[PDB]
Design a protein around this ligand. Structure first.
Ligand SMILES: *[C@@H]1O[C@H](CO[C@@H]2O[C@@H](C)[C@@H](O)[C@@H](O)[C@@H]2O)[C@@H](O[C@@H]2O[C@H](CO)[C@@H](O[C@@H]3O[C@H](CO[C@H]4O[C@H](CO)[C@@H](O)[C@H](O)[C@@H]4O[C@@H]4O[C@H](CO)[C@@H](O)[C@H](O)[C@H]4NC(C)=O)[C@@H](O)[C@H](O[C@H]4O[C@H](CO)[C@@H](O)[C@H](O)[C@@H]4O[C@@H]4O[C@H](CO)[C@@H](O)[C@H](O)[C@H]4NC(C)=O)[C@@H]3O)[C@H](O)[C@H]2NC(C)=O)[C@H](O)[C@H]1NC(C)=O
Ligand SMILES: *[C@@H]1O[C@H](CO[C@@H]2O[C@@H](C)[C@@H](O)[C@@H](O)[C@@H]2O)[C@@H](O[C@@H]2O[C@H](CO)[C@@H](O[C@@H]3O[C@H](CO[C@H]4O[C@H](CO)[C@@H](O)[C@H](O)[C@@H]4O[C@@H]4O[C@H](CO)[C@@H](O)[C@H](O)[C@H]4NC(C)=O)[C@@H](O)[C@H](O[C@H]4O[C@H](CO)[C@@H](O)[C@H](O)[C@@H]4O[C@@H]4O[C@H](CO)[C@@H](O)[C@H](O)[C@H]4NC(C)=O)[C@@H]3O)[C@H](O)[C@H]2NC(C)=O)[C@H](O)[C@H]1NC(C)=O
Ligand SMILES: *[C@@H]1O[C@H](CO)[C@@H](O)[C@H](O)[C@H]1NC(C)=O
Ligand SMILES: *[C@@H]1O[C@H](CO)[C@@H](O)[C@H](O)[C@H]1NC(C)=O
Lengths: 169, 207, 210
């Protein structure tokens, strides 16, 4: 316990991201007091970009794992995990640790921002809130058995497509 | 937007007069907000409010399933009056509409035959009657079996198939105990359709 | 247009799969392919396998502007209806996932489909045309083949019913061959041939007459 520990913030607020989305990482806590420094850490390694942000325009599999950031100070940022799954739809989330109560904000993410029709989110096989076009599912206050598997199904033009299990307890 | 699937009245219901038939119009896939939809049914073009509806049945997808009835008079649906469901919803920018009538054209009487159990299929456990309906159209037919005077249990029906000369046929099978058939009982294959001795006939069989 | 293309994979037809020496197919249609030159590239498996069993047949388009592609697979006999799985593993630039359907399946309760044919029915004798009937029951592998012969020519104007689920869970079906009154009262021999998975050398016929 020495300097204030920097940490890692995401762009956007999702970590399970697909095979050709844009993602941008950035760092706080730190900041080279005059000449912005970075030293990003990928899987416990190093990258040359020198920008206080970090681009990944064409994210693909090899861009998953653990990322960290250490500017001039920044102690050593505790790790952040980044996931990429191949496919069509996904259930993008900010957190996966919801005991008793916090905020829940889920996105049934498409692919190449191509729109969806008749998307629904699911509570362990059961439906909860269906919308016609694409949109996000928000809930404040937990329901003590959302503790379970969530995913979403949608119809792209006509092809009917599903996503993958995400159990949040 | 939401989708509607205009179902037709059950044949048996519109054949004869025992149960008043209905032309069900179902609107599925509508959300918890922007539900509330009205129906301007058209029977060739005259609205008339007398079109009762079912409650907001919820389905395992939050999706409200609004249903609606329209009691069509027994004597009309056979003339072919084109019945029209019209739904308008905030989710649908434009109203959608579906109209359906008599399976159009002109019919044909389906004189029916009752083929007996084949000879070799008797020296075995239970045996099978057959009732062959042939040469008709459209597919608004119903086949039932009767014994003595009460409808029989163990029977299945083949779906209609398109014959060579633009007509349908089916083979109604009835399994009966060899003991209950060989000794001798009376079994009648009855059929209802829109082109017979005023909607009905039946053909018996024994030995 | 577009929206992501699709795949379809069907089994072979029953006559080709059962009877020996009739090359059984297996096809993969890829419908709704178009405009921006998305290409082919297939690869089959049985649970680990190899190509060499296809080569596409050009680009049917006709009407809705979608470069339609299909390719085959020459299957064995003592192989299929025996366990193997089959996958097509399609891929394409516009589809962001090498997806593919599987097949095989329809399994279980095969047994003697002892076939029972019938004569015309009394009143039928008046009209110029009477129909012979052939019922099959006692078979569960969902599909089956049924044909007719009269001494020895494919009578090509019968009609056959589609199978349905009987009581005990063994499918049953019917067939109807229409002949003029004169040909049935002549005394010709008619045979209702049936082929299914569970028969001696896979065949039966119940020659019928008066
Ligand atoms: C939310 O959940 C509900 C329900 O959930 C599920 O419901 C069923 C299906 C089970 O799987 C349950 O386990 C499960 O919980 C979803 O609502 C469903 O949505 C689908 C749409 O994909 C509808 O499918 C349609 O079905 C009709 C036939 O409907 C009969 O059969 C159904 C399945 O067997 C049965 O469930 C129905 O009750 C119905 O049964 C008849 O019902 C009527 C009255 O309702 C009754 O009088 C009869 O007695 C009764 N008879 C029997 C034997 O049951 C079918 O017609 C539809 O086909 C149309 O569309 C196809 C695709 O385009 C096409 O291939 C067809 O040809 C046909 O197309 C139309 O055809 C003619 C001209 O050819 C014409 O009308 C049109 O021009 C043409 N095109 C169009 C677009 O109409 C289709 O297969 C389900 O019925 C429906 N279930 C309901 C309402 O209960 C809902 O989708 C879910 N939401 C989400 C987001 O997932
Ligand atoms: C643009 O191009 C063409 C336009 O052609 C059009 O064809 C029809 C629709 C008419 O409108 C024409 O006027 C017009 O020209 C479109 O290409 C077609 O697209 C349709 C659907 O959009 C496909 O339909 C599928 O057909 C399969 C079965 O396919 C056989 O039968 C067809 C007719 O029944 C026949 O046309 C096909 O050629 C094919 O026939 C086989 O052909 C091969 C080739 O040589 C031959 O070797 C075989 O012997 C022969 N066999 C037979 C029996 O004929 C059908 O299975 C599909 O149904 C699936 O989806 C339904 C809804 O999801 C579902 O109810 C079905 O059960 C099935 O779904 C799957 O079912 C099982 C479980 O039940 C399981 O696998 C899955 O869980 C389940 N779901 C899925 C997703 O798999 C469907 O009906 C045509 O095949 C296709 N190609 C043609 C016609 O050549 C094209 O779509 C157009 N584009 C657009 C955007 O519209
Ligand atoms: C980062 O870690 C992931 C998951 O362990 C791995 O697949 C990937 O290859 C790693 N990146 C590099 C550049 O090795
Ligand atoms: C489409 O997805 C839903 C579940 O996600 C299911 O009802 C339906 O069977 C699916 N269709 C296919 C072809 O898998």
């Amino acid at each position: 316990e020495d300097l204030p520990k920097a940490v890692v913030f995401l762009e956007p607020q999702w970590y399970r991201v697909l095979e050709k989305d844009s993602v941008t990482l950035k760092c706080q806590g730190a900041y080279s007091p005059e000449d912005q420094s970075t030293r990003w850490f990928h899987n416990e390694s190093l990258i040359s970009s020198q920008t206080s942000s970090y681009f990944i325009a064409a994210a693909r599999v090899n861009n998953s794992g653990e990322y960290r950031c250490q500017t001039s100070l920044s102690t050593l940022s505790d790790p952040v995990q980044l996931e990429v799954h191949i496919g069509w739809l996904l259930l993008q989330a900010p957190r996966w640790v919801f005991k008793e109560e916090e905020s829940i904000h889920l996105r049934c993410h498409s692919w190449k921002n191509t729109l969806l029709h008749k998307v629904t989110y699911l509570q362990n096989g059961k439906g909860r809130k269906y919308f016609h076009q694409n949109s996000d599912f928000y809930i404040p206050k937990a329901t003590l058995k959302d503790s379970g598997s969530y995913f979403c199904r949608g119809l792209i033009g006509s092809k009917n497509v599903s996503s993958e299990t995400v159990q949040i307890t | 937007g939401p989708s509607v699937f205009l179902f037709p009245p059950k044949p048996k219901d519109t054949l004869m007069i025992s149960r008043t038939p209905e032309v069900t119009c179902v609107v599925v896939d509508v959300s918890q907000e922007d539900p509330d939809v009205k129906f301007n049914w058209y029977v060739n073009g005259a609205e008339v409010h007398h079109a009762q509806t079912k409650p907001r049945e919820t389905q395992y997808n939050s999706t409200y399933r609004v249903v609606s009835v329209l009691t069509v008079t027994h004597q009309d649906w056979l003339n072919g009056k084109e019945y029209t469901c019209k739904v308008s919803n905030k989710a649908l920018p434009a109203p959608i509409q579906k109209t359906i009538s008599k399976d159009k054209g002109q019919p044909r009487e389906p004189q029916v035959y009752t083929l007996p159990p084949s000879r070799e299929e008797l020296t075995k456990n239970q045996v099978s009657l057959t009732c062959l309906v042939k040469g008709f159209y459209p597919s608004d037919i119903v086949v039932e079996w009767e014994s003595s005077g009460q409808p029989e249990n163990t029977y299945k029906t083949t779906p209609p198939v398109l014959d060579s000369d633009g007509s349908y046929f089916l083979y109604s099978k009835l399994t009966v105990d060899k003991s209950r058939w060989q000794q001798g009982n009376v079994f009648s294959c009855s059929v209802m359709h829109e082109a017979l001795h005023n909607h009905y006939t039946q053909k018996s069989l024994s030995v």
